[PDB]
Amino acid sequence: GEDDAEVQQECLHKFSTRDYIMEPSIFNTLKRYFQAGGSPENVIQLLSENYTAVAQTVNLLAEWLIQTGVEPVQVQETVENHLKSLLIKHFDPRKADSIFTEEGETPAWLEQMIAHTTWRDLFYKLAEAHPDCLMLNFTVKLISDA
Amino acid sequence: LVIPPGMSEEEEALQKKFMKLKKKKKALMAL
């Protein structure tokens, strides 16, 4: 009949992974957990036991580098290029077009990405490697129409 | 560094064995 015990452990697994407290999916995962009647007390345990603070550890490395004389804007550019590298590797046109058909209006973050010139470069490099994708053609036109 | 100039008994015996061996090696050489 009911899923409840399979779903529960599917969720307890994610709770165990590294720094799951940082993941955007954690809200969806917590709702699946409770709609499947999961007791909550051991969830706080899993999330805190497996917290490593990788992201805060990046902040530390950055300020250390800056204190030793690296220009701040350059640490920023390394960090941005890593986001940019991941986005180019995993770029799926069907996911991008889903941004559009999930709501006719565009999301607020698209018009915000466009204010930074490195993100506009990412969209241009994306518009070449995938010339017949709809979300990129829209975004390049949004930039141009600015 | 001080040594008496005269030879000891063991020294003179050595010099005698030296000469005994010279003779033997000459005799071996010819006959």
Partner: protein, 554 residues
């Protein structure tokens, strides 16, 4: 993933737990934690949705940033340590140490902290003590840091060098008692350069680095252990150490150890197993160059000469000069080269007596050793030369010459009352054995039964003697040769001295097939473990057992 994060105002897992427990609005708490503890780069906030939309986890973004930035910072630390003016150099690295050190037990960050200390000539002593207190910090950090700890905690240094010494000494004993009996190679065969590649002396060289103070501590350890144990192998290691730093061009030590040039000269003679005339005269000059008031360097020159490898080369050289003084028909008194070897040899053999009660005077040279003892030694040579030629001559007639089997009483008196006479007589015995001169050997073996300091029963002489006795392995079929060596020599001392018990069994094992079986069984009975004996002769006595039952299948 650790406590040190709180030291820098950054929440960790316990902070998270206290935040979520009994929270009136947990999901709001989570979303705030997410923004307060992510990468604090405002330009990311608009683009992270784009990554979230593709299902790529934030962990993969954060981790890959972390790997690059960490490597770049490691590179930057090396760059800062080899750049610019000194105080700017180490100020930047000290500042970074004060920041990052509270994170030293996080696995992802410990390499940064380790690298920073690795490049800091003077890690601050507060930090050093905190490193020394924790076993896994201390053990997993660079030798540049350890040296700074050792420099100011001698007992910890000592606890590090004691197990290396122990291994060394055990290796030296295993080498003198390995059942690898050979005339081709023996204990004194490997070159100084080869021996200096061993793992103990290389580890000691690495621990010392260029730190004069650590080197003095190692010298001090070797002196103390040499004094307490009389084990001459500690002298070899003191030589090997200084010579290792010589080959590594470590001038910070070599230019300030007054024994350096001496040891370097002596090391070339050891490599040739001979002191030629030039290096002899240079050794003489270092000896004569001992300035008044610094007479205790004599003690240290002695120790380096007490190196068994040095002793072996001096004794070999002495026996060679006798041999070629016979050809030149010259007396020992008339050979200045010979007196010089004797001077060096006497110092080496006296080293421990010197260090014991600090009387730093060269030993008195006994006139009679040059005028009486060495002359009797050369007589045995001339005798043996005369016997050889007596055979190549015809008409032996009555009395085909009998090999002289007589020892002048004064000879054995020198052997039993004088360190140096005993030593060179021992090496003259080693020579005739190597020549498999069965006649000379049987003439001299009696009167090795009682020697100064039981020197004829030392491990070094017995290792070489038994090694050379393989060249004569066939002679062990005859039982009066067999009993001349066992009943006449080895069994003289095997009940009282354990190592002689051990050597005797080790020679038998190597020679078991050649020995007449009824004599084998008798010797076996005479070499039984005496109940108060140690594990080494018990295992050796067992090895005899299996070899003597395996030989019975022929």
């Amino acid at each position: 993933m650790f406590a040190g994060l709180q030291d820098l105002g950054v929440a960790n897992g316990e902070d998270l737990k206290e935040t979520l427990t009994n929270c009136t609005e947990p999901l709001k708490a989570i979303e705030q934690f997410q923004t307060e503890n992510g990468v604090l780069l405002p330009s990311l906030q608009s683009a992270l949705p784009f990554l979230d939309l593709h299902g790529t986890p934030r962990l993969e973004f954060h981790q890959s940033v972390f790997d690059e930035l960490r490597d770049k910072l490691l590179e930057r630390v090396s760059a800062i340590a080899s750049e610019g003016k000194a105080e700017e150099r180490y100020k930047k690295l000290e500042d970074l140490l004060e920041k990052s050190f509270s994170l030293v037990k996080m696995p992802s960050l410990q390499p940064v902290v380790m690298c920073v200390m690795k490049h800091l000539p003077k890690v601050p002593e507060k930090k050093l003590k905190l490193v020394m207190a924790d076993k896994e910090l201390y053990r997993a950090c660079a030798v540049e840091v350890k040296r700074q700890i050792w420099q100011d905690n001698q007992a910890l240094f000592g606890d590090e060098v004691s197990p290396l010494l122990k291994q060394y000494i055990l290796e030296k004993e295993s080498a003198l008692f390995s059942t690898e009996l050979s005339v081709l190679h023996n204990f004194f065969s490997p070159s100084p350069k080869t021996r200096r590649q061993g793992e103990v002396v290389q580890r000691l060289t690495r621990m010392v680095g260029k730190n004069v103070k650590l080197y003095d501590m190692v010298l001090q350890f070797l002196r103390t252990l040499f004094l307490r144990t009389r084990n001459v192998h500690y002298c070899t290691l003191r030589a090997e150490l200084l010579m290792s730093l010589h080959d590594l061009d470590v001038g910070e030590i070599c230019t300030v150890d007054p024994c350096h040039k001496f040891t370097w000269c002596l090391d070339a003679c050891i490599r040739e197993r001979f002191v030629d005339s030039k290096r002899a005269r240079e050794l003489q000059g270092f000896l004569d160059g001992v300035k008044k008031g610094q007479e205790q360097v004599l003690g240290d020159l002695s120790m380096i000469l007490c190196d068994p490898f040095a002793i072996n080369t001096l004794a070999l050289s002495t026996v060679r000069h006798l041999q070629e003084l016979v050809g030149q028909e010259t007396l020992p008194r008339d050979s200045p080269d010979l007196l010089l070897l004797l001077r060096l040899l006497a110092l080496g053999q006296g080293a421990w007596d010197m260090i014991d009660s600090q009387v730093f005077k060269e030993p008195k040279m006994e006139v009679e050793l040059i005028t009486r003892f060495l002359p009797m030694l050369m007589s045995f040579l001339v005798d043996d030369y005369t016997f050889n030629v007596d055979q190549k001559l015809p008409a032996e007639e009555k009395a085909p010459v009998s090999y002289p089997n007589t020892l002048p009483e004064s000879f054995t008196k020198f052997l039993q009352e004088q360190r140096m006479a005993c030593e060179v007589g021992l090496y003259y015995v080693l020579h005739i054995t190597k020549q498999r001169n069965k006649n000379a050997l049987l003439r001299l073996l009696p009167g090795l039964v009682e020697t100064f300091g039981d020197l004829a029963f030392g491990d070094i002489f017995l290792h070489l003697l038994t090694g050379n006795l393989a060249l004569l392995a066939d002679e062990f079929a005859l039982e009066d040769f067999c009993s001349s060596l066992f009943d006449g020599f080895f069994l003289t001392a095997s009940p009282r001295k354990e190592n002689v018990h051990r050597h005797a069994l080790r020679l038998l094992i190597h020679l078991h097939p050649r020995v007449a079986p009824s004599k084998l069984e008798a010797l076996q009975k005479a070499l039984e473990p005496t109940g108060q004996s140690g594990e080494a002769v018990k295992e050796l006595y067992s090895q005899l057992g299996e070899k003597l039952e395996q030989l019975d299948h022929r």
